From a paper:
The structure of substrate-free [name] HseDH was determined using molecular replacement and refined at a resolution of 2.30 Å. The model of the dimer contained the ordered residues (1-319) in each subunit, two NADPH molecules (see below), five 2-methyl-2,4-pentanediol (MPD) molecules, two Na atoms and 212 water molecules. Our initial electron density map for the substrate-free [name] HseDH showed an extra density within the nucleotide-binding site and, after construction and refinement of the peptide chain, an NADP(H) molecule could be modeled into that density. No cofactor was present during crystal growth, but this molecule may have originated in the E. coli cells and was then retained throughout the protein purification. On the other hand, the mass of NADP was not detected in [name] HseDH. These results demonstrate that the molecule bound to [name] HseDH is NADPH. The electron density corresponding to the NADPH bound within the nucleotide-binding site of [name] HseDH was very clear, enabling us to place the ligand with reasonable accuracy. By contrast, the C2 phosphate group (O1X, O2X, and O3X) of the adenine ribose is tightly held at its position through interactions with the side chain and backbone N atom of Arg40, the side chain of Lys57, and via a water molecule (W4), the backbone O atom of Gly61. The C2 phosphate is tightly held in position through five surrounding hydrogen bonds in the wild-type enzyme.
Homoserine dehydrogenase (HseDH, EC 1.1.1.3) is a key enzyme in the biosynthetic pathway from aspartate to homoserine (Hse), which is a common precursor for the synthesis of three amino acids, methionine, threonine and isoleucine in plants and microorganisms.
Numbering used by the authors:
A (entry chain B), B (entry chain A): 1 to 319
The structure:
Amino acid sequence: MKVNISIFGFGTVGRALAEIIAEKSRIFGVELNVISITDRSGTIWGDFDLLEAKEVKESTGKLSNIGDYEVYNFSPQELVEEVKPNILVDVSSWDEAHEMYKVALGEGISVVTSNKPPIANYYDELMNLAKENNAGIFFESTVMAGTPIIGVLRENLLGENIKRIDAVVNASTTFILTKMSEGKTLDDAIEEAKSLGILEEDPSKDIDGIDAYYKAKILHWVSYGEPPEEEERLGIREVRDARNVRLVAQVSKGKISVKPRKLSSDNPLLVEGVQNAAVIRTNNLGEVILKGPGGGGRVTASGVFTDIIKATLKFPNLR
Amino acid sequence: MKVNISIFGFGTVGRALAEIIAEKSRIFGVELNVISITDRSGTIWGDFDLLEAKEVKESTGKLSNIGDYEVYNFSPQELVEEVKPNILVDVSSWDEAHEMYKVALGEGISVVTSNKPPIANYYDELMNLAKENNAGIFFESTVMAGTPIIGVLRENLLGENIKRIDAVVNASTTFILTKMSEGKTLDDAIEEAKSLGILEEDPSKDIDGIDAYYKAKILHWVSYGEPPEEEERLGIREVRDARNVRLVAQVSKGKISVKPRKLSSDNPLLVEGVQNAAVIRTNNLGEVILKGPGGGGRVTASGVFTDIIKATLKFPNLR
Ligand SMILES: NC(=O)C1=CN([C@@H]2O[C@H](COP(=O)(O)OP(=O)(O)OC[C@H]3O[C@@H](n4cnc5c(N)ncnc54)[C@H](OP(=O)(O)O)[C@@H]3O)[C@@H](O)[C@H]2O)C=CC1
Ligand SMILES: NC(=O)C1=CN([C@@H]2O[C@H](COP(=O)(O)OP(=O)(O)OC[C@H]3O[C@@H](n4cnc5c(N)ncnc54)[C@H](OP(=O)(O)O)[C@@H]3O)[C@@H](O)[C@H]2O)C=CC1
Ligand code: NA
Ligand code: NA
């Protein structure tokens, strides 16, 4: 069952995705074929070798330097319209990608993504558009990366009401907090973190809780099918004592609160390193706990790859 | 999109499933109708009220008593051939129920079950049959009950190779071991558990690791698509120091081992009460930890209900 895919973005995640696709292009009797890849240097399109495109991108920074192959310069809208993949995969850092998704879904093309803002802000609209056009949208790696919290909430627990979710979903903050608690100061830990590439030059998205808040909104969308009415977002800047503190997202019907919270030493959310975790409390089950890596190339691409096979087999979108 | 369901068995689990179905019969624009229920007293078939049938079974022990219906004494095969449900739901303790599943799958009827031996011993044959007849088989509650380990392994991690799984899946042994660690002797720990309903008169399935072995076998099936070549099963009879000991199932390609293991106090497998836990190690993800309740009527019916919804919508059976 042959499917053509366009990959938009070719960063740490897209390249790691290429490796997984190359190794598993025929799985469950499906056949996955990447017809295009797109970065800021333009879009390559046709019968190129996936691994060569990955080699080229790694070694030169650009898909344009590709050998034996020609580069087109599609805007997002034109990529969709000209190449016409079965599935558009977004693994870029373009915040406004929703406009692109609207065009694909308008044409019946399913979208798979690791990119958070479009889903966090436009889920309802995107879902309506997908349903109208007989397509799907999948976003597993937007929350806890390849650890399958989205699958769990969206395709399982189908007879449950979700009372709440509490999750620690931002390893950058965890690193800072762990350092503060070890002796270092806020600014020094921020500085040590920049130096390791775990924070960016402007560290705000992590430190002020933005990333965590986007992810919580995605959890709230899946769980209740609507945006929250009460919202609180706080970062870790005022944290004085960091021992056993984590930046915790607390989601319940109509309400999201992201803020630092103290945890007993045996709480499942007291996660270290790259780990994330979620406690989902439902009516029939009580607490269900899921824990796994929340970041990294392969880790993230694992999730997008799952979503690919699901778009291909037309998994429904029940939530 | 309307579906008829035959519930086979009506014990703790089937009665809780009647409640969840009554609360959520029209969900995701599906419409669930229970057209038959079957216990050892016979099968009721028709327009009976679901909750009444539950009330009567609970008060009297038998489906016979319902006002205005008389049971039919159907063999499993006659049940299937006459009632012709779209989904057959097995929530019974009948070990050999695979014989009934063959009949149903033979007719295009999908099977949802919480009953372990058929899946543990016949998954291959059942899955082939389902595929040949355009049907699915779902078994979420055969392992860790409503905690969605089967969903996670079977429909997620689709780009992954499962290196191993370690899982504590039998709360009864946890209760015994916890008593032993508190001072009690084996035989008293046992007797106390009988008195509380946690073990049966023959407690062997729990104590000698059989339940856990079946569960390990199912996880192996889903992870590798074949039976294991080597098999080790040990119970808890010989345990002496029970402190922090749990009966642990270990799965990896071609093998399963069930045995008691001492565990460090921060190991996620060191669960208490009704809790179960699974640690799934994959190539891209490392350790993925899932934890939740492993037993209880509502808890087990929750997983069954999810499976009903997936059966209705024709979810694929990738693994
Ligand atoms: N890595 C991780 O741990 C995780 C990442 N994510 C998300 O997945 C996405 C990918 O992240 P990652 O691979 O790490 O990030 P990188 O910054 O490594 O990759 C970003 C990619 O997006 C491309 N890109 C950005 N804007 C555009 C545009 N406007 N047009 C065309 N191409 C564009 C970049 O192009 P170029 O190479 O040409 O600059 C680059 O190829 C992001 O949304 C991120 O938030 C989610 C969970 C975990
Ligand atoms: N309770 C739990 O926490 C869990 C249970 N399970 C499994 O789910 C299944 C149901 O468990 P549960 O509800 O607790 O068990 P119960 O012992 O409460 O119920 C068993 C039911 O199956 C019926 N049954 C047994 N044999 C036959 C037969 N030959 N024909 C018709 N009906 C039959 C019994 O009928 P009658 O009432 O007439 O005797 C009874 O209704 C079992 O396979 C169990 O292993 C799985 C995970 C967790
Ligand atoms: Na995820
Ligand atoms: Na389960």
